[PDB]
Ligand binder design. Structure first.
Ligand SMILES: NC(=O)c1ccc[n+]([C@@H]2O[C@H](COP(=O)([O-])OP(=O)(O)OC[C@H]3O[C@@H](n4cnc5c(N)ncnc54)[C@H](O)[C@@H]3O)[C@@H](O)[C@H]2O)c1
Ligand SMILES: NC(=O)c1ccc[n+]([C@@H]2O[C@H](COP(=O)([O-])OP(=O)(O)OC[C@H]3O[C@@H](n4cnc5c(N)ncnc54)[C@H](O)[C@@H]3O)[C@@H](O)[C@H]2O)c1
Ligand SMILES: NC(=O)c1ccc[n+]([C@@H]2O[C@H](COP(=O)([O-])OP(=O)(O)OC[C@H]3O[C@@H](n4cnc5c(N)ncnc54)[C@H](O)[C@@H]3O)[C@@H](O)[C@H]2O)c1
Ligand SMILES: NC(=O)c1ccc[n+]([C@@H]2O[C@H](COP(=O)([O-])OP(=O)(O)OC[C@H]3O[C@@H](n4cnc5c(N)ncnc54)[C@H](O)[C@@H]3O)[C@@H](O)[C@H]2O)c1
Ligand SMILES: N[C@](O)(CCC(=O)O)C(=O)O
Ligand SMILES: N[C@](O)(CCC(=O)O)C(=O)O
Ligand SMILES: N[C@](O)(CCC(=O)O)C(=O)O
Ligand SMILES: N[C@](O)(CCC(=O)O)C(=O)O
Ligand SMILES: [Ca+2]
Ligand SMILES: [Ca+2]
Ligand SMILES: [Ca+2]
Ligand SMILES: [Ca+2]
Ligand code: NA
Lengths: 412, 412, 412, 412
């Protein structure tokens, strides 16, 4: 793959030149507000020590408290967390929620840690960054390798230092102040975004076949919402294998099978498939829901889809963007399509601060309102600048951050 | 009387066994988070010193900031405040408001103190606990022997240490950020709770006679709400005496007489009664609205009511529960029936942190909604466990607190 | 044994009557500033939970930050910690160090917990009281069942909440800011106190035989300091056994045996004896160095010593005091004789605050100066009030605290 | 040449291996406590923006508040700051002052910036890190490109956020709480260290010729102190040129020349010299006083000196260590030889806490005592481990840091 931060900076530079941003402002907007790397050392269950480095990149807070998840994944590194944090700054601005961008992570493999070890690691990480995050400062959330239980531990340990602070972290369990709809939000939002795009062509999800890479929090709920809107999901992969069915996979049955600890390749309602063949599978629509950088100069020519919906963060690098453009492929960008998560996190934060929770229908209605407005704004920018969808979104968010930055000023 | 904490712990033990709680979880849930006892010394108006001991027992905060009133009464002691604080943990969970449980108090008799002395004592108590309470930590309120003027002093003294903090205490005067409906909330909620129970029997308040022990914040508004629904209030007592009328007392006239500094025994619309005969008075419904432990093994066999509505905290001890069960008496438990006060306190707190107030119709509609949902949940819980109303409520709240506790976890 | 707080309060009342304190002042001085009880729950090494109640009693801060140790012992309870905290208030005032009194503890048996469990318990206790202690607020230290390693964990955990705070706790390891001389300070000060007393009779430590109950931090260093000054230590006990030698035990050899995990009853340089006979052993001087209340009305009549030096806190109850007085026994009281520990803790705190350390010769020279001045002040007070040594010291401390209290005043 | 952090980590691994440190302890000690990178953007005098990245690497605080300077230099980058911060941890431990290690910097070139721009940049950097530093947390100081005026601005800006905090930074101007002797301290300590080393051969500074690379705060005061001890300084260089005199340079005259804005090349008391030939000059003693890594695999074979005194931080990489060892060259390591600056910074910090300032002789005599004891400790370590001087110092410091770390423990 191309370096994640090289890739994201190329997109940033391209969006800057479209806006004609002042080069000094551009440099400021590139540099993160604050990068934090902390030692995270815990005792394992047997008493022996293990040490990790935890990252929290606080990229920009011009538009509000910083926002973005925490990734537990062995390939977490500073370039990846910096790219993801920068993308959070643009994404929060695309959907126009009052947040800036941050991201955190620990280079561990959760499969290799017991649940008590994962809890200790999460608490120690929180101890090491508690003074640098906060309800109006920087509010984490899940990402790959973390979930609502992880967020419970963050809330619990943070609150020892600062009092009960439900709004310090989102994606919480419902019974600890979480929001109805947040578990499903990213996948649902991907489908709202996809519906909005397809309507421009006079088409619907039910007209299309879909291939999905990754089957975790994003991939499961995306697949479910696609299936319920009549889409034909013809292939699904995850880290362990994959399953295909040209007639469409019964996603309801597939999810039930997964919840029983079944593996994709063993699902009886399709054919086991090599997961290394997922991205080049025949389909109308490809939805990467796992790692970034997976569409690159080596495989972009072999993509068969006419639409790519970026549910994962930065699945497509700029070399692939160019190849896929010349192939006639249309790419709905991450900073729009996957923003349902952070948008419903904003609603969770609002409910916590207000001391009163919303029903799930109100959460999703507001989510759809935000995704609809953002798409209309992206459309208008694409027309103004005669640019592609990625740049329509990137320039929309970049300009909103630039405006707030310029209003705040530069004197000491 | 039975020791209050022995009594309340016996009920906790019984509810824990119905739920099959793990014994180590049970032990943690019994132990208070933090017990605080502080010297409170003031100059009296003549300059001489008096020293009191103030309490704030913080029992459990798994479900949110702790909540519970402050009692000024001569029998305030550690066991009583611990029992009350534990009941707040279950009560907040029964009505499903995002609070844990706490309680405070001072062993004094307010009638013996001037209004300037009460103010000094209140401000000194606040000075001694300010660092332990807070909007998102522990939020007091009135109880026996305190009122909205007490809360105004707490607010005012607390705000010297932390800035304007209206949400630090509830039961405030309207002109200092209090909620419409809060003064009447506990007594009105008692009547909503009672109507909900009686509907299960195809009966209304207007079918019944009522005897009420105590005639302060809870007893007055309960009596008023009963009277306005056609209930016959045939006996009322307070510390100083009692009055009866088997035809029903004109509660509007009784309240006017009280407001004029009249004594119950002197009311011309009834007959003076020995207050010691109140609990055993001939009535359909007995509502204790004063001290706890007043129904016990020595008088329970003499109760004539078929319903007991626990407006007071813990008026019936476990020995009396058994005796009254064998008499066919139905007891609507404190942790449900009197939760209207803490419920509207939640609404007050919400109005304060949100910086915007509600009208009284909204307050009371939501109070009714919360009291109805809780009763319906208690009923279902009774069916699930084939248990009495007390255990239906106690297990409902205990289970919710256990669920939050287990999510939060145990590592340091 | 008499209740520890009943015993200590009887002494307080006796001293108050000697001074003629105003009854309202007296009542205020008795009541603790703040009593704290906190849940302390940890996972054991096998993951199962254990729950303890931790105590910090903050008795009085009129003269400065509160000071006193943390006891891990199965008989720790509120009465014991209240008595100990009150004694620290008088003791700090007897030696005229600028501290008030406090004490903490957990009712546990350290021998039944692994070293990792003891660390987690210590860290959780610190998390539960961190907001209540502080360099200028309340500074803990060791007591029975805790040591410098315990203090290292308190320092380390506290510093996560408040930054590096070496002066928040004393008795630290040298490599974490501890003071030279602090490990030996209580036993050495016992010897300085004893030498001051014996000079009044024209006697030396080398003239006397000694029996010592307890052989931990206080007993080992006391025995060593006596041995090195030619005193004959004829009996030593601990919780598992006892050893005697009428010619004097070779304490250097006894300590080496202890350091090799030997038991007292097995030491080859004496005869085994029943530890239940230690306090009635023939000797000139009896030094209790373990639990309180061990000299009581059931054994005081059989004591054979002419001098009792109270190294332990409150080893002699007031019934035993009277019996022993009538036997001609002279008792050098705890609040003077064992104050070397807290005095060198003061020096440790000063060194930490000043940022540089003293050598051991300077520590011990200053310790001797403090113990000499205190004894001279005690003698003077005994002459003024024609009272015994205990009351001379107790009234000296109580009067100093009363002075500071009256200067601070009582208005809000 | 070699990467600064690769180099320093090789030395750490070598010292770890000598000590036999467990791999899990070794890994923890390598990882910094906290790495911080912050945007520092200011308006230039003409109003146009410039943006820099500022660093504060907090490597280890086991032994106390972290300590280390701030470098303004165009080659400042994360690897350099990390290496320097790690060296501060070992250095502080070598001289046995109660500090851990940190370092900061900004990748600017001060010659580019006006004095008002340098002030704004320093103040903005302070605004960005004030929450990270503090009297008992992390105390900065000068380094390359900064001076006492830089420290005045840090103090002034920091104090807006936290009140007057003289001890938050050392190297301050004398008129704002600085210490006499601090300006000259690093160079004077270099000479104390050198005198101690040469005494092991029965030789003195006055027996040797010297070449000095760098002529700033370290190089000028090192040159002056060597000159005043009869040393023959035959060559001196800085960034702009160099000067040699085989008969010895009149350093007093050279320092007046420099104070007159003269360049080394113009000095009439010498012959101008290519500065690229400084390190290979014909001398007995080479003293690097500028950048790190200047002695490497490319030029170590060409060094003619028989002694290298490391005044600069990490002037010699491990490839050159091996080459020079083979040529019989003795290298006195940075973590010992240049520790006079941080030692007198410790004295400055103590004076600020004490509230009174020492005379210069007291400072320098105490500095000499610290440098003499450290050298004796190093020699003992070399003998114990049969290792070179660098490892004698590195293991002495590393062991002290390990010991404090192990005392503190690992549970959360
Ligand atoms: N969770 C959110 O709220 C959210 C929001 C927006 C975007 N995202 C992005 O969506 C992506 C997925 O996050 P998630 O929350 O679903 O993570 P998750 O940990 O819940 O699941 C990740 C899934 O990807 C699979 N996967 C991992 N490596 C793979 C590989 N090499 N090939 C195929 N499958 C692989 C895993 O097996 C699993 O099915 C990430 O890029 C994340 O940053 C997440
Ligand atoms: N106020 C609230 O919001 C609230 C909420 C829930 C439950 N409660 C409980 O309701 C009960 C009453 O509290 P309140 O707020 O009305 O107190 P209050 O001080 O306003 O009134 C107390 C009343 O009880 C009477 N009383 C006291 N001792 C009595 C005795 N021995 N016999 C008869 N009457 C006696 C007093 O004379 C007075 O009429 C208490 O158990 C309290 O904990 C109060
Ligand atoms: N450590 C201090 O600085 C300090 C200061 C002043 C006073 N004190 C008091 O000194 C006494 C001893 O404290 P320590 O620090 O030496 O404790 P420690 O835990 O170091 O040692 C306690 C000793 O007492 C023995 N002991 C326990 N129960 C016993 C029993 N039933 N019979 C005989 N011996 C028994 C133990 O076996 C052990 O030898 C306590 O009263 C303590 O409060 C301690
Ligand atoms: N200042 C202190 O207290 C202190 C303490 C210990 C060690 N050090 C180390 O000493 C070294 C010098 O620091 P300083 O305070 O003297 O810095 P400074 O900014 O005062 O002076 C640096 C000097 O080095 C010269 N120089 C720069 N680049 C050069 C090059 N390529 N070749 C030759 N000369 C060059 C400059 O011209 C100037 O003479 C650094 O490694 C620093 O980390 C400084
Ligand atoms: N996974 C996310 O970080 C979610 C962030 C949030 O909910 O705050 C994302 O990539 O958007
Ligand atoms: N009196 C109460 O404590 C009410 C508490 C509140 O309103 O917060 C009660 O007993 O419920
Ligand atoms: N063990 C002590 O509490 C010592 C207290 C201290 O050193 O601060 C005591 O009993 O004096
Ligand atoms: N220049 C230094 O950082 C000294 C810092 C200090 O004086 O604290 C160094 O490299 O030692
Ligand atoms: Ca920026
Ligand atoms: Ca508990
Ligand atoms: Ca008191
Ligand atoms: Ca480390
Ligand atoms: Na274990």
């Amino acid at each position: 793959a191309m370096n994640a931060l090289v890739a994201t900076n190329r997109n940033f530079q391209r969006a800057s030149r479209i806006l004609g941003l002042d080069s000094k402002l551009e440099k400021s907007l590139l540099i993160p507000y604050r990068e934090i790397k902390v030692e995270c050392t815990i005792p394992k269950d047997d008493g022996s020590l293990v040490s990790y480095v935890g990252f929290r990149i606080q990229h920009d807070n011009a538009r509000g408290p910083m926002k973005g998840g925490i990734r537990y994944h062995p390939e977490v590194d500073p370039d990846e967390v910096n790219a993801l944090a920068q993308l959070m700054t643009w994404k929060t601005a695309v959907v126009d929620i009052p947040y800036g961008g941050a991201k955190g992570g620990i280079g561990c493999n959760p499969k290799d840690l017991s649940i008590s070890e994962l809890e200790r690691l999460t608490r120690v990480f929180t101890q090491k960054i508690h003074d640098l995050i906060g309800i109006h400062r920087d509010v984490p959330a899940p990402d790959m390798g973390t979930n609502s239980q992880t967020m419970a531990w963050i809330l619990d340990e943070y609150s020892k230092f600062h009092g009960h602070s439900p709004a310090v972290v989102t994606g919480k369990p419902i019974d600890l102040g979480g929001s109805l709809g947040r578990e499903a939000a990213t996948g649902l939002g991907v489908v709202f975004a996809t519906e909005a795009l397809f309507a421009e062509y006079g088409k619907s999800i039910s007209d299309m076949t879909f291939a999905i890479q990754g089957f975790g929090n994003v991939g499961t709920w995306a697949a479910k919402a696609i299936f319920e809107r009549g889409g034909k999901v013809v292939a699904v992969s995850d880290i362990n294998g994959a399953i295909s069915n040209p007639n469409g996979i019964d996603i309801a049955a597939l999810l039930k099978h997964k919840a029983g600890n079944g593996s994709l390749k063993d699902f009886s309602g399709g054919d086991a498939m090599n997961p290394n063949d997922l991205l080049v599978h025949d389909c109308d629509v490809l939805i990467p829901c796992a790692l970034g950088g997976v569409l690159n100069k080596e495989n972009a020519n072999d993509v068969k889809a006419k639409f790519i919906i970026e549910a994962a963060n930065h699945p497509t690098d700029p070399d692939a963007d160019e190849i896929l453009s010349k192939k006639g492929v249309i790419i709905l960008p991450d900073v729009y399509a996957n923003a349902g998560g952070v948008t419903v996190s904003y609603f969770e934060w609002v409910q916590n601060i207000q001391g009163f929770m919303w029903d799930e229908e109100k959460v999703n209605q507001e989510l759809k309102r935000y995704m609809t407005k953002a798409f209309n704004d992206i459309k208008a920018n694409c027309k103004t600048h005669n640019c592609d969808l990625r740049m329509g979104a990137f320039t929309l968010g970049l300009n909103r951050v630039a405006r707030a930055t310029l209003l705040r000023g530069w004197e000491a």
